[PDB]
Amino acid sequence: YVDVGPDSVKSACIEVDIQQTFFDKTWPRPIDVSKADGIIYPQGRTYSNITITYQGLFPYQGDHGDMYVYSAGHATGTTPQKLFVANYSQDVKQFANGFVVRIGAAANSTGTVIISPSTSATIRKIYPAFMLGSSVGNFSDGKMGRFFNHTLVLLPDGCGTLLRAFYCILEPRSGNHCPAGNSYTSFATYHTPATDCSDGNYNRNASLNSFKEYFNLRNCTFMYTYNITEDEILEWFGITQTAQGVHLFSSRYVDLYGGNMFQFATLPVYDTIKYYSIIPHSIRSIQSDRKAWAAFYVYKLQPLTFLLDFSVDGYIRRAIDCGFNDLSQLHCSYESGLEVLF
Numbered sequence: 001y002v003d004v005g006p007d008s009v010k011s012a013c014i015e016v017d018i019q020q021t022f023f024d025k026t027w028p029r030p031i032d033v034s035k036a037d038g039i040i041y042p043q044g045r046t047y048s049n050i051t052i053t054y055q056g057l058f059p060y061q062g063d064h065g066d067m068y069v070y071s072a073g074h075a076t077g078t079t080p081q082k083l084f085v086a087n088y089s090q091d092v093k094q095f096a097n098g099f100v101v102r103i104g105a106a107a108n109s110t111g112t113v114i115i116s117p118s119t120s121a122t123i124r125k126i127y128p129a130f131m132l133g134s135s136v137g138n139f140s141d142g143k144m145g146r147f148f149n150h151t152l153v154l155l156p157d158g159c160g161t162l163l164r165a166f167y168c169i170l171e172p173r174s175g176n177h178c179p180a181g182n183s184y185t186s187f188a189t190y191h192t193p194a195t196d197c198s199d200g201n202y203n204r205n206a207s208l209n210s211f212k213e214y215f216n217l218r219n220c221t222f223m224y225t226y227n228i229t230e231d232e233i234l235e236w237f238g239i240t241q242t243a244q245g246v247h248l249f250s251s252r253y254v255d256l257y258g259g260n261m262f263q264f265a266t267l268p269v270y271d272t273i274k275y276y277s278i279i280p281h282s283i284r285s286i287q288s289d290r291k292a293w294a295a296f297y298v299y300k301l302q303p304l305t306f307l308l309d310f311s312v313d314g315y316i317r318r319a320i321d322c323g324f325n326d327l328s329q330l331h332c333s334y335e336s337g338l339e340v341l342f
């Protein structure tokens with residue numbers, strides 16, 4: 001097992017204010033595969049200057065997915081207070097074939113800082129966090145969302161300049177507001193920009209430290225880190241699992257400006273992932289310097305046959321969900337003539 005640093009010495013957990021109605025929004029970003037939304041590139045091949053049909057894992061055309069948003073926490077002036085989160089931890093979902101994620105799509109536009117609904121700001125990309133595992137249950141106080149045995153956690157850190165991936169047993173700590181203590185509402189992560197995101201030295205452990213206040217990590221088989229540099233370019237992230245382990249996908253390395261998803265990591269996770277949840281994050285900003293953080297959208301993958309159109313340089317710029325309707329199915333027919341198919 002790997003060392004992930006000592007246990008948190010913090011006596012209690014930061015209090016967490018759950019107010020789902022403040023996170024109920026109508027911000028639709030449905031899958032449009034004609035724009036190659038949510039496309040994992042064929043994993044074992046490359047294609048170029050050609051139109052094919054291909055059996056892969058894809059989201060449904062038009063699927064709205066599940067929207068998630070992170071918010072600045074409570075504050076009075078320069079003093080951050082309670083965290084402010086949605087009810088995501090108690091909403092455990094089926095992993096099935098995995099999923100893909102639209103990240104940062106609203107960045108640069110104007111949005112709300114959520115905690116103060118009428119306060120507006122320029123929207124900034126924020127990365128999502130996930131808890132995934134084999135079996136789930138309830139915390140001591142009866143709340144849902146506890147992952148048992150070894151659990152995969154994907155957690156951004158360093159103010160969005162790294163993604164952490166680790167596989168540990170999560171032992172809920174017993175302090176005040178912790179998942180095995182009094183007055184528990186939800187776990188969450190946080191960072192504090194005034195001390196964690198100073199220009200010179202970002203705190204690359206701030207989010208992990210916050211997580212370790214809610215859970216003690218035990219018998220970690222791995223702790224991986226992947227560097228990210230700062231920009232506001234939207235991205236796609238995907239995850240699947242085969243016998244080879246858990247596969248992480250991103251557009252950042254290979255198709256930063258186009259969105260196609262390519263594998264960048266394979267995690268030694270061989271117990272079947274059956275469940276996942278979204279880990280709420282709350283930013284401990286001062287009241288006067290709150291930001292608007294772009295919602296991300298999660299879409300489940302399904303075994304589907306897609307038409308895939310590859311540009312000359314080899315990237316997918318157009319797709320069709322063959323099974324979406326009869327007209328779409330004709331595009332994927334080698335006899336119809338609506339497309340020139342290989």
Ligand SMILES: Nc1nc(=O)c2nc(CNc3ccc(C(=O)N[C@@H](CCC(=O)O)C(=O)O)cc3)cnc2[nH]1
Nearest residue numbers: 027028029030069106110111112113292293294295
């Ligand atoms: N903090 C924060 N995060 C955000 O992501 C955010 N996003 C918005 C804006 N979100 C959206 C998203 C989609 C549409 C939109 O134009 N949707 C179409 C329908 C698209 C379809 O269903 O095909 C529409 O006409 O409403 C508008 C605003 C505003 N404040 C925010 N604030």
Ligand SMILES: *[C@@H]1O[C@H](CO)[C@@H](O)[C@H](O)[C@H]1NC(C)=O
Nearest residue numbers: 003004005006204205208223
């Ligand atoms: C910070 O994170 C790294 C990478 O996971 C870990 O090795 C280290 O022990 C952590 N430091 C502390 C003080 O927890």
Ligand SMILES: *[C@@H]1O[C@H](CO)[C@@H](O)[C@H](O)[C@H]1NC(C)=O
Nearest residue numbers: 048049050310311312313340
């Ligand atoms: C790509 O295919 C088109 C359509 O057949 C053709 O006109 C074009 O010359 C091809 N480009 C290259 C670089 O092969």
Ligand SMILES: *[C@@H]1O[C@H](CO)[C@@H](O)[C@H](O)[C@H]1NC(C)=O
Nearest residue numbers: 018019020087088090091185
């Ligand atoms: C979270 O969602 C569950 C399921 O709908 C519900 O029973 C629970 O009361 C919710 N908690 C909060 C704080 O909204």
Ligand SMILES: *[C@@H]1O[C@H](CO)[C@@H](O)[C@H](O)[C@H]1NC(C)=O
Nearest residue numbers: 136137138139142143144145
């Ligand atoms: C966990 O809590 C939910 C909500 O009350 C309940 O329906 C479910 O039966 C509980 N599971 C166990 C194993 O007690």
Ligand SMILES: *[C@@H]1O[C@H](CO)[C@@H](O)[C@H](O)[C@H]1NC(C)=O
Nearest residue numbers: 135136137147148149150169
């Ligand atoms: C987690 O694993 C241990 C040992 O492998 C087992 O005793 C325990 O029952 C497991 N968790 C649950 C909720 O069963």
Ligand SMILES: *[C@@H]1O[C@H](CO)[C@@H](O)[C@H](O)[C@H]1NC(C)=O
Nearest residue numbers: 001169170171217218219220
């Ligand atoms: C961690 O592993 C050791 C040896 O495999 C085992 O004795 C111990 O019980 C494990 N810890 C937990 C919390 O299961």
Ligand SMILES: *[C@@H]1O[C@H](CO)[C@@H](O)[C@H](O)[C@H]1NC(C)=O
Nearest residue numbers: 158161162204225226227228
């Ligand atoms: C990742 O970032 C850290 C901190 O800036 C740096 O020390 C390390 O060399 C970087 N790794 C890569 C592969 O760029």
Ligand SMILES: *[C@@H]1O[C@H](CO)[C@@H](O)[C@H](O)[C@H]1NC(C)=O
Nearest residue numbers: 104105106107108232233234
């Ligand atoms: C936001 O603006 C930057 C700089 O102009 C650009 O690189 C990025 O693609 C934009 N992001 C979105 C989601 O429009």
